[PDB]
Design a protein around this ligand. Structure first.
Ligand SMILES: Nc1ncnc2c1ncn2[C@@H]1O[C@H](COP(=O)(O)OP(=O)(O)OP(=O)(O)O)[C@@H](O)[C@H]1O
Ligand SMILES: Nc1ncnc2c1ncn2[C@@H]1O[C@H](COP(=O)(O)OP(=O)(O)OP(=O)(O)O)[C@@H](O)[C@H]1O
Ligand SMILES: [Mg+2]
Lengths: 400, 305, 410, 412, 410
């Protein structure tokens, strides 16, 4: 796919220059205080999201962005007739110049934005998005809980920290809970469609077995025990009754058609169990990644779908009772999941409110989900970057 | 840089509840991760590297062993951490014959030493070297080269140990890595003889001193036991020396069919990255544990954690 | 259940008295303009819904209410030392009393979390169970109210709409309990999802039962199986799986190349019959509601469709040209017919349907059929309608009740 | 003074208990995620500030607080006849008891002038002297909170920020008492003005006493060099911005001496007067210079300093750059502002308090975390610092003061 | 300084023309009701303050302003193609021109971020240096304005008060530039702090310079030294140290118990005299202002008090019974006298004192002394006062200027 491979900044904030060269899988940016980590994350997020109207609010000279396939974007801030103009020039030669004052007026009001998105959609600059995790995730989550959440939180955070700040679009825990409920509903409907298919399929399988001339009962017993004690079946979890009826009628009565029907029944049971496991594959993988971190609780679902936290006494609690660090762990593990949106994960200070035993495994459990996405983190903690010191990038800007 | 100091890491040991292991380099971390994950693929042991711990002292800055000894001394008695270092040439006797005074893994309050010179000496079992070189080969004349190599590997360890001892006598440990080239090696009837090449980029004084030390140390190495001999070879030196010895034997036995093809294959093998060789040897070493009684591993260290 | 049967009013606005007896099924009310039918509707809604705090905003002396189970409620307004009080007395002797000014201060505090008086009223109606039956209230201005809601509501979340309505029409006005089309759409989607889940559970149970019955053991049977497969393939409800005819053809091809097979054939036919009957059993309420709704719509029909590509069953308008549209593109009269039919449907909650002027924005064809289609759903709800047109009340002249206020000389 | 010594919790949120024993100087509190560190800090800050009406918003059974002098406060939440009640019982038998619904109604009325319950709570905490020591509370969310405050607060007038933070994070959260950098700048200006006035009073007293001593005692090579060194050191100080003419007066006195016993007494009392003025300048500016030396140990390319000019009459306090530029203390970054506030709270200039910091490693580089606790403890204020951290770089070198938290889950 | 000299108006509100020349020291204006004196005050305030955007709210033809240094400014309103324009042209040839409707749009944008026209006006008044001297505008309703402010303002932040005044009395009304009594109190505290720091610097300087008088070195001097010590110990300014009497007694005892001694006595007397004279010089402005204020106060006096426990001095009313009261206990007339005397004080900045009806809630004895006390301070500012009371303007009949509006036929 398309990944950021180089970012150059010239006279940004009229203060410094900085050229960063990236990897395609993991980048651990680190540096001293005021080295420009957060501004680098903002530049990357604004370029990748295609939100070039943010660059009217940044004082700079030239910003060059190189992707993996060779696409290059050059953004310049020129001064003519005591007016600043932002010029975006691609590698294709197609360019767009817009005035700073018009962009500022449209921002304060919220035509030019339509031209910008026409230019972006013409050249496919929004092929891959970026999930932006700010350094102020906790108070923003607490404020917004008291894409519309993205819009309101982006407006509030841009009011607080300036208008260059990108659109906050990381998955909030409420969004995580809602999308988990939707995926559980979709998995239940897929199981229903599979049962409706396999009913008519197993009928002609039985009819094929009836026209041709021991441990199977134990295997059917094991499959029925596994399926009856499965949380994914909220309806008709009584295969033990029909298994007992089948074994009682067998022990009361050898036809080869009975053995063929037992083979068909065992195959139907194991195939329904296999489809039931593969329908809940993403949800179980995500909750297994989360539950490898949580100590005295366990994120789980139960049957209307219920998604919450089981405690060792068996009581349930919502996700809202979680800590700040545990909620941040949930969001950062969801952004790297396969059910999360495929993007470029940009996290600013991922070590916030995380114990060092979680910092040492955060990047490992994010890269072990085989998402294939590019992760760029900016950290102050040596425990985030442990085990992955080959991917550490140290930024030392040249101050002027 | 963004790394812990000695005191910060000690505080991390106080705060962290994981089972930990401290090793010198990142390559030792990767090899030990494969070793641990073979016995327990779901193991939760965290392996730290002393290479990624800052030291205020200039001398202690690049001395990984001194960092490990300092940390071990200051937390001597903790239960959740174990330490592993490289034995180097410690506890070895050079009284005209190579003698191992331990013949087992050293242990001193969760501080352990490798059985050989370093961790890579575990790869020096002949079956592991064979399997690894066979898997990572140009795949042109592999079978005959492996057949010749299995004959040469028995006596070649004396040569490798003599090279390492000659390097440590003049304190130029990294000298044979760039000095000796695969073309200088000659394949005899089970032996090898690294001819003193007339042309070398380095000054003749160093080359002459190296061969004087090699000649003065070779009969002593010959009289020693082969098994003890295979453990004193320097870890970094041995990998490259085996790479050249295999490039030489491959070209020696493959030149008659096609000299150019054999030379290209030999140069391709000689240009292989050290990391590729070590990873292939590590995978072979992991697979051979428990199948052959002649493959060793830090059993005490694994048992302790 | 519990139905209202008699309402006696004394000195409403200190000018007229009213006493109207009611039936348990249908109560058609007819009269002249300004007869006080809307005030009677507000009184009945506040009595049935248990919102007694509205009764502090009425200038009256005594209100009597009688239910079907024998519960009688007497509401009395007193004025002692210039301070006005409301006393509500039940039939069993339980009663409460409060102040008019205290209730007005509570309402003003709500305008500017329940207070102590509202919690007292809630506790009194909870420990006596005075809200067994609710009442869906249809105001005469609901066409403006739905436009106000769409330019800015449900049966449970209607606080701002009720506040706006009570701002426009005084604080005696009851809560707006008639549902929104979005609530109807969400209820339809939830009913469809629950029907699909029950169909899947019954399919698993039927497959297990047929497999138990089929082991350890003709042309007309195949014809009936073919007819069942054709009927199930040509049904809207089987959008997730519509391949029964291929199953029938494979069964017939397996049979044709060569007793005990007849038993498997009849249990397979009975399983297909059980699935066909269970689908109609699950979708009976939705099909009855859509049959009542589509009996009025001409160029469109409300229908559901579930594609296998998506997992969200889409409910909405369908045109004969094949277009799919949401329910918000309906006009005022179609939306009124939809809401009044859902209020009389079994899908809605058990309440009393109180409608003021049902002939709002309706053609004269729909007026003669609205009450017939509401009563044909057989939900058993009690319906009280106040109309001025005979086209509403045609064919139901025995339920027509006239209101004659009793003027007193003062 | 009075410091906390033991906090015992019982069934917080009906699931876990905790018992923490504290030290009187520094308490580095660490634990796993979700252990209950921030809740413990909120409990301590509510108890020490005497804001017991917060405890109607927490589900618990019993919270005990022991101070250093032996005063024990026991807060118990009971449910009598479905009505919940908070009872605060001291060790001298004095107690109060109120309703949870009454406290919620009082807080809602404050949201929309003290009520009867607030006046009764304040009377109970005032007549028992429960509010001797304050509690500076540094929240974990302070970095965005001060940005919100500057986009629209002090240790004493922080009602809007505390109300907003309680709106976001629930009503049990304590008041935001940590000093803003504006409060730090105002306190630095007031301390500089007080030190200048004390220096002036010392000048008047020393002038009168020195004239009396000269006139009474009226009826040398080393002395002139020592007076020269003292006048050179006096002219080479920032504190002498209003007068830097000591060397000229010394040269005039030396020229009067050199052209021609009794003068030795005048010379030694002149040396003693210069020594006394220099030592009083060191004493009167001791706390300000100590705090600014602690802050300037962190800043790299700038230093916080004050300047006196004769043309104006306002002592300028702010950042100073090596190129001579001057900038105020609001041009600091977020991490430097965190250092400024966390070092002023542990200084002698701050109020007598217990410094409760939640996640002190927020927006700090790993080089500043290794020196933060050392520079807080090196000012010798005599405070009690309680920090809740996840960082081993904060806690390094202070493993004797580290407190582990492990709550005990109780089944239900 | 720069003072106004000549004001010429053409067709103010298209009804009257006015041409009044002004003195550089005092401008007393008398006239009948509705003569337009307030309009002239607003015109002068908008001219001097540089707030020319108020001139879009005035219907005029040509306004000519001539200062003392020769600065002539011509403001012309034109109506071209129904669009009204304002052109301001200086005497040096520099000019600007802007639309009236654009100015009103900018004003409405300010009512509902600086616009381009406001920045252009700022550039025009910055590159031409038209705002060297400010102008203090005293409205006739300033007591009601400060009562409204206190029941809910400064010379630098009065935007809410300016918006309220422009809403009540038209948008032509200029910015409220008269100082509040709270601003007077804050400026008094600031000047007391400046005087204290100057006294500290002089104390350090005198401590250093006393030894150069000592190294350079009877009964008649002791009496003067005792009197100086009594004066220093009985002074407000020496609250931090008032122990000179013990020093005098010890000096006299050491003299009596047993040349250069007379030299030491005379340099100590000179040092104490210089210390007292420097303290009087440092507090001279505040003492002159308080002497001007206390001439009107009967049973109290505005005074400053130091303290040794706290270092924050207190400015307020001291009674002969010993009570201390703040400035908010003063009445309306005392507050007006305080603001007018601070307007004529040397502590305030160089501006033009524009007062309309200074006699608001003033006793007739205070009106005869107000202008005398204002001119006794010798501030040198230009004062334009519009009054209807002859007791204000007595004794200054040479500066009394009558306004004669020249009515035009239309
Ligand atoms: N308007 C501005 N916006 C942002 N940074 C600015 C601005 N003006 C100057 N700067 C400086 O530019 C640099 C950019 O730093 P940045 O805001 O990215 O913080 P950082 O490197 O993430 O540091 P940290 O989070 O550790 O405080 C800083 O030195 C900052 O002081
Ligand atoms: N309302 C609630 N009901 C039940 N449990 C709760 C509730 N609120 C919080 N908790 C749990 O109790 C603890 C509360 O304290 P808290 O989250 O602040 O601890 P912490 O160790 O400081 O957290 P952090 O992970 O942010 O460092 C957490 O374990 C949290 O999951
Ligand atoms: Mg940052």
């Amino acid at each position: 796919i398309r990944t950021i491979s180089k970012i150059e900044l010239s006279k940004i904030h009229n203060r410094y220059n900085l050229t960063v060269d990236f990897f395609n899988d993991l980048n651990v940016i680190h540096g001293k205080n005021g080295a420009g980590k957060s501004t680098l994350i903002h530049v990357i997020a604004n370029i990748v999201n295609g939100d070039f109207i943010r660059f009217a609010f940044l004082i700079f000279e030239e910003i060059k962005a190189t992707y993996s396939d060779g696409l290059k974007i050059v953004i310049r801030r020129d001064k003519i007739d005591e007016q600043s103009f932002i010029s975006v020039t691609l590698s294709n030669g197609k360019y767009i110049k817009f005035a700073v004052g018009e962009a500022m007026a449209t921002v304060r009001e919220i035509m030019l934005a339509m031209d910008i998105d026409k230019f972006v959609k013409e050249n496919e600059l929004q092929k891959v998005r970026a999930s932006y995790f700010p350094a102020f995730r906790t108070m923003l989550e607490a404020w917004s809980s008291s894409s519309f959440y993205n819009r309101k939180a982006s407006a509030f955070a841009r009011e607080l920290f300036g208008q260059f700040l990108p659109s906050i679009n990381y998955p909030s825990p409420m969004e995580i809970e809602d999308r988990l409920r939707e995926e559980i509903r979709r998995a239940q409907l897929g199981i229903a469609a599979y049962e409706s298919r396999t009913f008519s399929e197993s009928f002609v399988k039985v009819f094929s077995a009836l026209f041709d001339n021991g441990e199977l009962l134990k295997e059917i017993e094991g499959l029925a025990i596994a399926q009856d004690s499965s949380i994914k079946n909220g309806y008709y979890a009584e295969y033990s009754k029909v298994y007992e009826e089948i074994r009682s009628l067998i022990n009361r009565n050898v036809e080869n058609s009975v053995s063929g029907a037992l083979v068909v029944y065992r195959d139907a049971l194991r195939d329904r169990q296999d489809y039931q496991e593969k329908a809940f594959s993403e949800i179980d993988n995500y909750m297994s990644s989360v539950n490898s971190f949580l100590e005295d609780k366990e994120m789980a679902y139960d049957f209307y779908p219920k998604v919450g936290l089981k405690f060792p006494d068996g009581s349930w609690s919502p996700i809202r009772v979680l800590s700040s660090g545990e909620r941040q762990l949930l969001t950062m593990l969801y952004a790297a999941s396969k059910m999360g949106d495929d993007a470029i994960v940009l996290i600013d200070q991922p070590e916030i409110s995380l114990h060092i035993d979680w910092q040492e495994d955060l990047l490992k459990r994010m890269l072990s989900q085989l998402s294939g996405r590019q992760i760029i983190v900016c950290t102050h903690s040596p425990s985030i970057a442990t085990g992955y010191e080959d991917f550490m990038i140290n930024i030392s800007p040249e101050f002027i | 840089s963004c790394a812990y100091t000695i005191d910060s890491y000690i505080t991390l040991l106080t705060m962290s509840s994981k089972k930990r292991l401290l090793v010198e380099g990142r390559h030792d971390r990767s090899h030990l991760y494969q070793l641990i994950y073979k016995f327990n693929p779901a193991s939760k042991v965290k392996i730290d590297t002393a290479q990624d711990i800052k030291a205020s002292d200039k001398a202690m800055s690049k001395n990984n062993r001194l960092k490990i000894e300092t940390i071990h001394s200051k937390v001597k008695g903790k239960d959740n951490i174990s330490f592993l270092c490289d034995r180097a040439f410690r506890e070895f006797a050079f009284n005209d014959q190579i003698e191992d005074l331990l013949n087992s893994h050293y242990c001193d309050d969760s501080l352990y030493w490798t059985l050989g010179h370093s961790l890579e000496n575990y790869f020096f079992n002949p079956s592991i070297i064979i399997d690894a070189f066979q898997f990572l080969s140009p795949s042109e004349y592999k079978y005959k080269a492996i057949e010749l190599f299995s004959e040469l590997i028995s006596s070649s360890f004396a040569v490798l140990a003599a090279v390492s001892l000659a390097a440590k006598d003049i304190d130029k440990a990294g000298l044979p890595a760039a000095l000796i080239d695969w073309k200088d090696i000659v394949i005899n009837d089970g032996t090898i003889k690294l001819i003193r090449r007339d042309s070398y980029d380095i000054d003749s004084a160093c080359v002459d001193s190296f061969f004087n030390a090699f000649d003065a140390v070779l009969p002593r190495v010959i009289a020693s036991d082969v098994g003890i001999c295979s453990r004193v070879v320097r870890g970094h030196t041995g990998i490259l020396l085996l790479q050249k010895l295999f490039s030489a034997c491959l070209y020696y036995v493959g030149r008659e069919d096609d000299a150019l093809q054999a030379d290209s294959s030999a140069n391709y093998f000689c240009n292989l990255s050290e990391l590729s060789l070590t990873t292939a040897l590590a995978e072979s070493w992991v697979r051979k544990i428990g199948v052959l009684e002649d493959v060793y591993f830090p059993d005490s260290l694994l048992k302790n954690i």
